Structure 1
Amino acid sequence: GSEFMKITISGTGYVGLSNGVLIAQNHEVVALDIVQAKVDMLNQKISPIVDKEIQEYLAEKPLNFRATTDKHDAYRNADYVIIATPTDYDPKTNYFNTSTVEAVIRDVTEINPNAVMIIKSTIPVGFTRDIKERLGIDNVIFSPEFLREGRALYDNLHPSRIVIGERSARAERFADLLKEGAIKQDIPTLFTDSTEAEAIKLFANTYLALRVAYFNELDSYAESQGLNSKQIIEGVCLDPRIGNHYNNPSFGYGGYCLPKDTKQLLANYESVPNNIIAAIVDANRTRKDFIADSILARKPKVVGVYRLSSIQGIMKRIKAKGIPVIIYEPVMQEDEFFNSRVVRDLNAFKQEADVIISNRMAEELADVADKVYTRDLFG
């Protein structure tokens, strides 16, 4: 009887907490965290992370939810344990650090070997099949998370889809828990085998990077041929097989996931003949070179950056010519960024900057649009 289940969350970042609040609406949830201070705020119904819906739900809804720093208390009697501890992939060494996930698997296997673990942390392709065989256990299943930090609970209440990397009754029972707490009805739900589930996000994220890189190359062509990029892009994207989003020219795809995931996938293609996977990584370098070359042809003595991640690679190329960069970014409280000077006064910024670069056009820049370079079209 799923109605009487206990679900434990191990890791209280946005993924763990989102899943915990979602499920606690209808079931008993216990969140384990190593930091006593976070357990205290949670038990006082205060969210330790910035997320509107999570704070609203914890303070205003009757959730059968509590936290603890105690492992035995957290895991015992758990039907499912959702693992959402920190992990990190480093492209330079091709090293994926999964130590927090393996430590949790260790603890649960010792404390409650009957619990079914659902890993939501990001792990390498093949991780789950491998750890099951290494430890001689079977109670571990991977399920990707498609949440955006800052709208994590919102995304679990309105998910694109639910994917559980096991084809069985207990996987179907866990998918039911996720849909029961959701606001969206009829959520597409897919059951796959293990390694296939772990590859979905890399292929999905790499496709998005590909799309951005493609529209960026279309933009490189338009600039070099003196054409209106927006006219071409809008005409192309009115084809419904292509669609009209994720098509805004930029200085390169960036953010915390695409650069790393594209490289992670390329590393997984080590012995698979391919041209597109490798080109998606190379394309971003080529685009930043093009953007930097276009700015440098203007012969600036100083380049100003209006607001602050691909623009960092543009800064790097400019500073390699001995050209200083000044930055205007109020959100930044630092004195410098990658050694370059943050300027608080906006009117001095416009005066000194021979070329102002930005991933978005802006109202205040109108007066100096003649020296503003942005390829943004739809921001």
Structure 2
Amino acid sequence: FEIKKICCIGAGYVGGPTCSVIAHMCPEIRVTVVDVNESRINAWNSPTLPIYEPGLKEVVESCRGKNLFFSTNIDDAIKEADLVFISVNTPTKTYGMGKGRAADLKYIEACARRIVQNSNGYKIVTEKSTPVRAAESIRRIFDANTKPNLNLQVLSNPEFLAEGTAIKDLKNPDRVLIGGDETPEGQRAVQALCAVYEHWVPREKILTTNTWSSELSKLAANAFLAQRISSINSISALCEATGADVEEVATAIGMDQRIGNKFLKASVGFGGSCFQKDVLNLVYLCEALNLPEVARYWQQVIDMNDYQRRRFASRIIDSLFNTVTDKKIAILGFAFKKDTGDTRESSSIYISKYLMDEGAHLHIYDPKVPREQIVVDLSHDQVSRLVTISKDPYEACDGAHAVVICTEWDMFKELDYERIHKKMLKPAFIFDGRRVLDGLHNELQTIGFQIETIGKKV
């Protein structure tokens, strides 16, 4: 009927911030986040949260201990909950079928079973990572382990938040998506969860589908975004060959309202822990379902990304006459995008890897990524021989043959380039992988730099 108590299994990004927001917006609902990881739970109950998000500390502390609880007691929280969120990791498989592409359902299934063991009467169970087949899997387990007077409803409610802006995104979503059965039972359940979201979210922005659609939506959304980036990246190679300019072309394209102007910035390649993972998973799913045409269609988004990184590296190596042994090269930017410390699937790792294959002496600078993270990312002895992590950008550039800008940190616009030039070996190259130095081209060339950028003919 009404949702008064909520259990969230999983205290990560998927479930921590969401349930904190729910308990901040609905004073009447007892929200209990549970996790087997004790050190994670103690961090949520500390004055410093295990997740860095703007305004998150304030949201939690305004209701923690009131109607928001972080507990290591999973069993009991399930027992007394009207609604159980499942938001646990779904890491990519590391061995077996779909190795490196398919998602691993083991934690979802283990949570599904713990729910049965600890559960009585009516409950609504909503999965939040939403890989394809999660809901089907949870359904199979519930149906095969029933009890008298046990009625578990299964729903799907994917998270669309982006890290860095989790709270704004949670308070002001483009849409909320809930999936459930096209049954009179399933309808009863979708309504219940809707009523929770309607505390801060208009009904206009709440969309109800079937469980399969919510699963495929999350995946497809991220695939379309990634496609946009590879599309404009493919154009960038064509601009380099013709004398067109990818920033002019992208702006022209974006002013068509049927297309819109977002996700059209050409780059050395997309990164982050969402896009490649989701496109690879989509490809796997199509192969497994005997849809090879659709699989090869989506594979191109990955192949284009790979090609964009390789041709960038290759252009650097060719400018150096195909010899980079013992030459110092500055890598400016290691984060996968600016204004974050996240390096997952960062394009800098890949470019670095290519230059290390050439025996380059890499001096790497990034204002936010820790030295420890960079070392681990490049390793898998080569790192010890070839990689220096520079304290400052000038240190990285001192006596370098080339400067390679890999991340679009704003500070790179405003470095003293005349000084950098003096201390570089000649010819001094600047390779701009992010169009971050647009407008400075005439000045850099008169300073003496050979300056090159994605999507611009030499």
Please give the TM-score of this superposition, normalised by the length of structure 2: 0.75
Q: Name the residue aligned to 1:310.
A: 347
Q: 1:117 aligned to 125, 146, 155, which one? A: 125
Shift of 1:134: 4.1
Contact 1:160 1:187 (C-alpha < 8 Å) held by counterparts: no
Correspondent of 2:59 among 57, 78, 82: 57
Distance in 2 (CA, whole Å) between partners of 1:281 and 1:253 is 10
Q: Partners in 1 of 2:140 and 2:126 — Cα distance?
A: 16
Mapped to 2, the partners of 1:294 and 1:185 lie a distance apart of 51
CA offsets, 1:240-281, max 9 Å, x none?
A: 112212111111111111111111111112121234312111
**Aligned with 1:373 (options 431, 440, 445):** 431
TM superposition shift of 1:186: 4.6
Q: Which ranges in structure 2 are unaligned for 5 or more consecutive residues? A: 145-151, 335-345, 422-427, 438-458
In the alignment of these two chains, the number of paired residues is: 375
Answer whether contact 2:333 2:348 (CA < 8 A) is retained.
Answer: no
| Residue 161 of structure 1 pairs with residue 175 of structure 2 | yes
What is the identity, as a one-letter code, of the residue corresponding to 2:31?
V
> In the alignment, what sits opposite 1:217?
234
Deviates more, 1:352-361 or 1:245-254: 352-361
From 136, 147, 159, the equivalent of 1:145 is: 159
Q: Which residue of 1 aligns with 2:393?
A: 346
Q: What is the match of residue 136 of structure 1? A: 143
Give the partner amino acid of 2:89: P
Q: Report the Cα offset of residue 9 of structure 1.
A: 1.0
Match of 1:329 in 2: 366
Q: CA deviation at 1:119?
A: 0.7
CA RMSD after TM alignment: 2.4
Name whichever of 55-64 and 195-204 sits farther off: 55-64
Asked if the contact 1:76–1:112 (Cα under 8 Å) also holds between the matched residues in 2, the reply is yes
1:117 deviation in Å?
1.0
Give SS of 2:403's match. Answer: strand
After TM superposition, the score normalised by the length of structure 1 is 0.90
Contact 1:127 1:195 in 2 (8 A): no
Amino acid at match of 1:154: K
Structure number, greater radius of gyration = 2
Q: Is the 8 A contact 2:7 2:84 kept in 1?
A: yes
Deviation, 1:174, is 0.3
Spell out, residue by residue over 1:171-200, the C-alpha distance to the aligned partner (whole angstroms, 9 max, x if none): 1210220231x2x53552222212221111
The alpha-carbon deviation at position 213 of structure 1 amounts to 0.4
Cα distance in structure 1, aligned partners of 2:92 and 2:403: 34
Q: Select 1:67's aligned residue among 70, 73, 80.
A: 70
Which of 91, 96, 110 matches 1:88?
A: 91
Contact 1:7 1:29 in 2 (8 A): yes
Instruction: Tell me the secondary structure at the aligned position of residue 96 of structure 1.
Output: coil
Contiguous gaps of at least 5 residues in structure 1: none
Name the amino acid aligned to 1:281: I
Alpha-carbon separation, structure 1, partners of 2:394 and 2:436: 26
Deviations along 1:17-60, one digit per CA (max 9) or x if unpaired, are: 22212222321111212234444454567533222322102223
Q: 1:117 is aligned with what amino acid?
A: V
Q: For 2:394 and 2:118, how far apart are their aligned partners in 1? A: 62
With over 3 angstroms needed to count, the CA separation of the structure-2 counterparts of 1:243 and 1:84, relative to structure 1, is same
Residues 224 and 296 from structure 1, CA distance in 2 versus in 1: closer, same or farther, beyond 3 angstroms? farther
In the other structure, the counterpart of 2:189 is 170
Residue equivalent to 1:16: 15
* Residue 214 of structure 2: aligned partner: 197
